[PDB]
Every structure is written in structure tokens, then in C-alpha cells.
């Protein structure tokens, strides 16, 4: 968790392992997949919202009416002052959200695998853990996924 | 509910490029994978490339490798083709899918297709 | 992506009574990793699994498929005459995807 990696590829977050079986990166298709639905209807819902179907031709007074000028200029320029003071409110307020929306992801998936990776798996702080027990693909991806066997293995306990 | 829509039928010259526009109705922001199909006249379909989501990250087979090039502009959910060097063996029917999840795994909505056929 | 071989498409059989399809993997894949549509003649393909066991959404309970590697075979609990068409097996390791000959499925 404290640094990004480069080698990753197809899921803003993933796992990693060095087991003799092989060592390389994966995604969690679940978590992705998850976060992407709340980013695509967060984007939409701000589109919807900013209707854009209008009229804005401008017209002109003659020199008599200048009050008429002064008052009309107030109008359009009030408006795109209002409009762009919500532009960039909801858009700079929602960037933060998200940014804090991966974060619990993410971390909510690292303390996902501590409950399903019990003690037996010593934890380095450095979003990593150490396991007792040897284990091959078929257990590494049961931590991956949503099944694991912790009663079958007890070594050093 | 949303539906898929290709652009018409075209007819090119051999050793040119066409190019197929996919699209989806109401076609708003959107992360859905896509990919591509051949169905030649008589004969069973065969896989040719997709992308993957946000990621933009694109795979095609063996047999081509450098001949087709696919880019979806996600913001109007569309996606685009560009294959090149077209030759006899080509004239088939491309079809436009998704697998309703960013990767690019099994396909389940697929559009109405388009028939290219290459002669002088 | 991987090669997949197939038995001979002759599979000639009449609506109402047991039926399978035969696709075989070259080489044993992921559970999950396995698909199955349904064409007819002048018609895009249309869905009927999905991960080998998962049944698509609007299909009754007239298919099922099982197999795991190498053994990959489908069977239908009755056939209909609108059921009738040629299928195709997908196969998608990772970040990939394949499909088959197709069956020459045929009535009497």
C-alpha cells in the first residue's frame, strides 16, 4: 500500500506473490469492477445535472435604452458567474471524494485478507505478509478469492 | 436497456483500410469492454482483439498482430476499427461486443453487424 | 488463446430426446474460462453459458454442460425444433479468446 506499482496492469488493485509455483502480478476483477460502476454513474449523474439546452443569442439596444443594456449585461454576466462558481465546486468537491474512495478500497480489501488470512501469516507492516506454511497456486489464489482453508493448515501453531 | 448499433455496410478496394464505428444507444459514459468477430460466409466465428476498460490495455491474436487497431472513446461509449491491408480471404461480417464487465471476458450483448466485402 | 480441437461436426438427431455437443480443450483451463452460443443461419450468436455451469439469463432448463481440462461436453435435456442451431465454445485464458469449428448439427 505505500507505493504504486508499474508492472501491474488490468485493475487498480491487485495482490502479488513469490511462490516457487511463479511470481507475478494479478487483479482483483471484483474490487476494479465494483469501484468503476460508482465512478461511471458519478461522472453521469454530474452531466445529467448540467443541462445545457438553451437559448443564449444576444441582442443589442439602441443609445436611448442604455439602462436596458447595463441591466441585460448584468443578467448574462451574473449567470456565468453563478455557473461557473457550481462548475467547479462540484467537480473539485468530487475529485476528493474519490481520491478517498480508492483509499478505502483498497483498504478495505487489505483488511478483508487479514480476516480471511488469519496468524498464520505474519504481517511486515509494509502492506505485505509472511506466511508459516508452504503453499502453492491452488491455496495462494484461495486467498485471491473468496474461499480459503484455514483449518487444513496449523504449522508453527 | 441499451442496444448496440454499427455503422452501414461498405464495400472497399483490395489493399485498402475500412474502418467500423460501434456505438450504444444513449451512448453516456462508459467503462463496458469491447471486441471484434469475424463470421466468414459459412464458416464459425474467430476471435480478433478487444480492449479493457479505463485501462486502455489492447490484446489481438497471433495470425495478424500489426494489421488491426482498436480505440474506443469511452466518454461516447464508442468503438472504433482500423484495420489495413485487406485482401479476398477478408470479406466476412464484423461484429461489435461486450462482456458487461471491464475486462474482456465472455461477451453477452452484441450488435446488428456489418457485412464488408473486398473487390474491384 | 489456445488450440482447440473437435470431433466430426455429424450430429444428426430429431427434437424431443437427449442431445450433446462435443468440444474438447487441446489443453486443461480454468473452470471459468469456458462459454456457449447459440447462431442460426442469417443471425448473430446468442448467449447460453457462462463459466461451465451458469446458466444465462433468459434460457430455460433445457441445457446443461459440465467438464473440467480436457473433457468439455454439453447435452440438452429435450430438443426443440427452434432450440436447433450450431454451437460455439469459447475459450478465454486471460486476456484473450478463442472459438470452434462449429458443429454440423443436422436433422434426419
Known amino acids: 500500500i505505500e507505493g504504486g506499482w508499474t508492472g501491474m496492469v488490468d485493475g487498480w488493485y491487485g495482490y502479488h506473490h513469490q511462490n516457487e509455483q511463479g511470481s507475478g502480478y494479478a487483479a482483483d476483477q471484483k474490487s476494479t469492477q465494483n469501484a468503476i460502476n460508482c465512478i461511471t454513474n458519478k461522472v453521469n449523474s454530474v452531466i445529467e445535472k448540467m443541462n445545457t439546452q438553451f437559448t443564449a443569442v444576444g441582442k443589442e439596444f439602441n443609445k436611448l435604452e442604455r439602462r436596458m443594456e447595463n441591466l441585460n449585461k448584468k443578467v448574462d454576466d451574473g449567470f456565468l458567474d453563478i455557473w461557473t462558481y457550481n462548475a467547479e465546486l462540484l467537480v473539485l468537491l468530487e475529485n476528493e471524494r474519490t481520491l478517498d474512495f480508492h483509499d478505502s478500497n483498497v483498504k478495505n480489501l487489505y483488511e478483508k485478507v487479514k480476516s480471511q488470512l488469519k496468524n498464520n501469516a505474519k504481517e511486515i507492516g509494509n502492506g505485505c505478509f509472511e506466511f508459516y506454511h508452504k503453499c502453492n497456486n491452488e491455496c495462494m489464489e484461495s486467498v485471491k478469492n473468496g474461499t480459503y482453508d484455514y483449518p487444513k493448515y496449523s504449522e508453527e501453531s | 436497456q441499451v442496444q448496440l448499433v454499427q455503422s452501414g455496410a461498405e464495400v472497399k478496394k483490395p489493399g485498402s483500410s475500412v474502418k467500423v464505428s460501434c456505438k450504444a444507444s444513449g451512448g453516456t459514459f462508459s467503462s463496458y469492454g469491447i471486441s471484434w468477430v469475424r463470421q466468414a460466409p459459412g464458416q464459425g466465428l474467430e476471435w480478433m482483439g478487444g480492449?479493457?476498460?479505463?485501462?486502455?490495455?489492447?490484446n489481438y491474436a497471433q495470425k495478424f498482430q500489426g494489421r488491426v487497431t482498436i480505440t474506443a472513446d469511452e466518454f461516447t461509449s464508442t468503438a472504433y476499427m482500423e484495420l489495413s491491408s485487406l485482401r479476398s480471404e477478408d470479406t466476412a461480417v464484423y461484429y461489435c461486443?461486450?462482456?458487461?464487465?471491464?475486462?474482456?471476458?465472455?461477451?453477452?450483448?452484441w450488435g446488428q453487424g456489418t457485412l464488408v466485402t473486398v473487390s474491384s | 488463446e489456445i488450440v482447440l480441437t473437435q470431433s466430426p461436426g455429424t450430429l444428426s438427431l430429431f427434437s424431443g430426446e437427449r442431445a450433446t455437443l462435443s468440444c474438447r480443450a487441446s489443453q486443461s483451463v480454468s473452470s471459468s474460462s469456458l462459454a456457449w452460443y447459440q447462431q442460426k443461419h442469417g443471425q448473430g450468436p446468442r448467449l447460453i453459458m457462462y463459466?461451465?455451469?451458469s446458466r444465462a439469463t433468459g434460457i430455460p432448463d433445457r441445457f446443461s454442460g459440465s467438464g473440467f481440462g480436457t473433457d468439455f461436453t454439453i447435452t440438452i435435456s429435450r430438443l426443440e425444433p427452434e432450440d436447433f442451431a450450431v454451437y460455439y465454445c469459447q475459450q478465454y485464458g486471460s486476456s484473450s479468446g478463442t472459438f470452434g469449428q462449429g458443429t454440423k448439427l443436422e436433422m434426419k
Open positions: 461486443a461486450r462482456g458487461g464487465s471491464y475486462y474482456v471476458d465472455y461477451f453477452h450483448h
Open positions: 463459466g461451465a455451469s
Open positions: 480492449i479493457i476498460g479505463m485501462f486502455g490495455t489492447t
